[PDB]
Structures are given as C-alpha cells and as structure tokens.
Design a protein around this nucleic acid. Structure first.
Ligand SMILES: [Mg+2]
Ligand SMILES: [Mg+2]
Lengths: 82, 286, 82
DNA sequence: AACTATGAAACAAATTTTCCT
DNA sequence: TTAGGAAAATTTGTTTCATAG
C-alpha cells in the first residue's frame, strides 16, 4: 500500500532534473512522460537491475558506516573520459 | 495532554534528576514473536539495571514508564523494530502493567518513597518485530537491517503543587540485540588507563569479548556536531596477549600543541566491518 | 535533449534526493516503489493535475527568464510545506 | 571502434527468522 | 520459561555472457 510521491514532489523533481533549475510546462510534461515510459517498460525484475547497476557502475560507491553500509554517488566518477 | 515519546527530555530540571544507576549489559538477545521469551535485560555483574529519581520528598508513589527506543545517532525516539516485553510471575521483584501509546509499547513500574524512589528494572525483556512487517508500515522509512541496537528509555512525570508537571527522560547505554552481532562484533568491557600526555607511548590493557588476534584498535576525534578529523592506527600486540585482553600503544595526539586537555574516542575493528562501540580516553595539556 | 530514463539515472536521483546523499539498497527499492505506485495510477488527466499544482502551490513560481516563461522552485517555500 | 544500456544466471556472503534441543 | 545453537530464509553485492544502438 505504498503512497505515491505527490504531484508537487514529482513536479519539483522535474524542474530540478534540468540543470537550469527551471523548466517550461511542456518540458515538465515530457519529464513525466519519460517516467511513464520507464516504469511501464521495466515492471519485471527491477529490484535485480538495481543491485546489478549499483555494482557495475563505478559511480556508485558503497561506503561503510557506524551503523551499516550504504550507497552513495561519486558525482565525479561520472562524466566523460573520452 | 500526554507527552509524545518522540519529544526528548532532560534527566534533571532544577532539583529533579532521574538517573540510571546501573546500566544494562552490552548485549541482550531479543526474542521473536514466533518464539518463547528470552528473559529480562540484565546487568554486567549479575543484577538488572537500576533507575533512581532525585529530589522527591512528597510521599505519593510515582510511575516510571519504560520503553525501547533507538540509539544510533539523531534524536532519541521509540525503536520501530523493537518492543518491550512484560515479564512477571514467580521471581521478578519489580512489578508492572503494560500499555501501548501511539504505536509503541510502554511498561510502567512503581517508583515508591519507601525505597528513596529507586527501582530495579527486573521486568523488561526485548521483543523483535519482523523488519518486513515494520518497514512497510504506515508512512515509515527507518532502516531495520543492521539496525539492532536499542536503548532502555525511562520516563517519569513529577506532579508539583502548582499543578505543573516537568517531564524527565533518561536513556541507557546502547544494547546489542542481535545474536550474530553479539557474537562477531568486538566488545570492550573494562579499560585500564584513561590519561596520557599528547606525546603518547603507554600501555592500556583492554578486556572484552570477540578480541581475536587480528584486532586493531583505532583512535578518533569527533566534534560537537559530528565531523571527523582524526583516525590514527594505534599498533597492538606487544607480543601475544590473553584470549580476550589487548595491550595497545596509545598513539600521538593530533598536534600535541594543546593547553587544555582533550577527551577522545577509540574503538576496536576486527573484520573489515566488524567494528566495536566507541570508547573514551583523556589526553593532557602541553 | 530528452534522453530516456536509465537505471543509473534514476538510481543517482533516488540517492542524491536523500537528506545526506546516501541510502540503503532497501531504501532505493522503496523510492522506486513509490514511483511505480504513481506511474501506474496516474489519471488520464494528469497534465491538468500538473498545471493545477504549478499555480495552486506557492512553491512553484513562473518567471519570464530566458527563452520563454519557465517554471521554477522557490526552495525555502517548498521546504516549509513539509 | 570505443562507450553505453538492459537483463538472466550463478556465485559469494552478510543478516534475519524459524526451528530444534 | 529461559537459553544456546544453528538450519532455513532473506538479502546484498560481484561477475560473466549476450544483445543492441
Ligand atoms: Mg560500483
Ligand atoms: Mg504558484
């Protein structure tokens, strides 16, 4: 019975998913459409694709904590090395 | 209006002070619903924790309400994965009736003047809730995995003449509730030395459990906030050692250029993750 | 442009959009779930819902900046709402 | 001709619950 | 009841092999 992020939460993310930190109404719509596209196409074994991805990609570095390990993202490890 | 358990409270107000005399053992294996009771929380030597109030002359008896809350950092609240477990019958000196507030179980026990308001928490075991059931509850997002450390929280509401009621809360030392953790995690029982000049170079025989031979004591300095600034390997094993004893060489403090003594924390980390609980040590001025 | 969503991108977002920029595998599962629990229940009338939320809420301010009118988040005003 | 994206299988291994004396 | 052990379940984190733009 998981509650869905309300519109404001989603609408905000859509405005931030844009480097400019500002978007147009149509762009916001497309952010939502892309999200529909995703969860529609991958409603299978996603949880597996999440363990996979965290390990494959180098930008996800598991770090130890006084409590337990947790995942983080090396924003630098991303980008191009062309 | 009752006081929400999430609200922190002081241990004393003016002349009123609720203090834990004897803290509980470093670890208590909690039982699951599907099983039997795994006894009451105990105390190191052999007894059970003791709580006492300070500055209460009125002859009316009071109620100390015990409840299991978190430990690991942040604000102390009730623990979403654990519940206190009433223990009564045959033995058990201290008596208690249970109740459930909000979503937490709370035991209340008699705080009577005929015992200078000091009670021995001999009636509270710990029950583990299935991480599964509690993580998918109503609007809750606390991590349950690895989270198996709790604190015996104690509360008492003092009734004054003006009709006012100042609320006092405690918080026992962290307790390890997981059978696996209790077995594989490094434990420090009784230290040995607490002071030393910033220069370093002294022995401090440490005793506890899970002290293998590959142990390696580490030193660190935290802030009033929670930042790190020092982690110095503190070489061990002068030779051999006692199966659960450890002789480490106290490192050399950050810059040794200090006019005012500094209290510090040092733990024990066996496996690449199997860490111990932070300790206390005190350096001295220049 | 408008690249499609990848596991890497969503994962990065779930983590970065955390108080301390780090989360457990399970927490990332949770995040994805709330997203599933929306992008499968969206009414065939969401755009209206988005337009509705943009002005209705004081946390989404429209500015005449750049190319055309664009939407933006008044962070602190949004933070208040919570 | 790198570089990127997606996914099933099989391990390895860390943790939690259920079971058994 | 009150434990102590530990098998059974769950979970997490790595790699390898194949597919496509
Ligand atoms: Mg990685
Ligand atoms: Mg608005």
């Amino acid at each position: 019975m998981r509650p869905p992020f309300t519109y404001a939460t989603l609408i905000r993310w859509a405005i931030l998913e844009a480097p400019e930190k500002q978007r147009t109404l149509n762009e916001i719509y497309h952010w939502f459409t892309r999200m529909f596209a995703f969860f529609r196409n991958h409603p299978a074994t996603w949880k597996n694709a999440i363990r996979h991805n965290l390990s494959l990609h180098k930008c996800f570095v598991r770090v130890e904590s006084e409590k337990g390990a947790v995942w983080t993202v090396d924003e630098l490890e991303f980008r191009k090395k062309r | 209006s009752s006081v929400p358990l999430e609200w922190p409270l002081s241990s004393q107000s003016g002349s009123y002070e609720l203090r834990i005399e004897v803290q509980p053992k470093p670890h208590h294996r909690a039982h699951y619903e599907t099983e039997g009771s795994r006894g009451a929380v105990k105390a190191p030597t052999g007894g059970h924790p003791v709580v006492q109030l300070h500055g209460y002359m009125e002859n009316k008896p009071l109620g100390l309400q015990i409840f299991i809350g978190t430990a690991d950092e942040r604000i102390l609240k009730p623990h979403a994965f654990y519940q206190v477990h009433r223990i009564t019958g045959k033995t058990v000196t201290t008596t208690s009736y249970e109740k459930i507030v909000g979503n937490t179980k709370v035991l209340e026990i008699p705080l009577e003047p005929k015992n200078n308001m000091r009670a021995t928490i001999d009636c509270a075991g710990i029950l583990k809730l299935r991480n599964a059931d509690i993580e998918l509850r109503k609007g809750e997002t606390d991590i349950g995995r690895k989270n198996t450390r709790v604190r015996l929280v104690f509360r008492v509401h003092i009734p004054e003449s003006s009709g006012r009621i100042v609320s006092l809360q405690t918080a026992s030392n962290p307790i390890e509730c997981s059978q696996r953790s209790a077995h594989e995690l490094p434990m420090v029982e009784r230290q040995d030395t607490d002071s030393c000049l910033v220069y370093g170079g002294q022995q401090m025989i440490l005793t506890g459990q899970n002290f293998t031979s590959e142990s390696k004591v580490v030193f660190t300095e935290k802030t009033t906030d929670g930042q790190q600034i020092w982690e110095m390997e503190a070489t061990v094993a002068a030779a051999a050692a006692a199966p659960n004893m450890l002789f480490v060489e106290i490192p050399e403090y950050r810059n040794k250029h200090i006019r005012t003594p500094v209290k510090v924390n040092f733990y024990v980390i066996n496996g690449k993750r199997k860490r111990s609980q932070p300790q206390h040590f005190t350096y001295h001025p220049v």
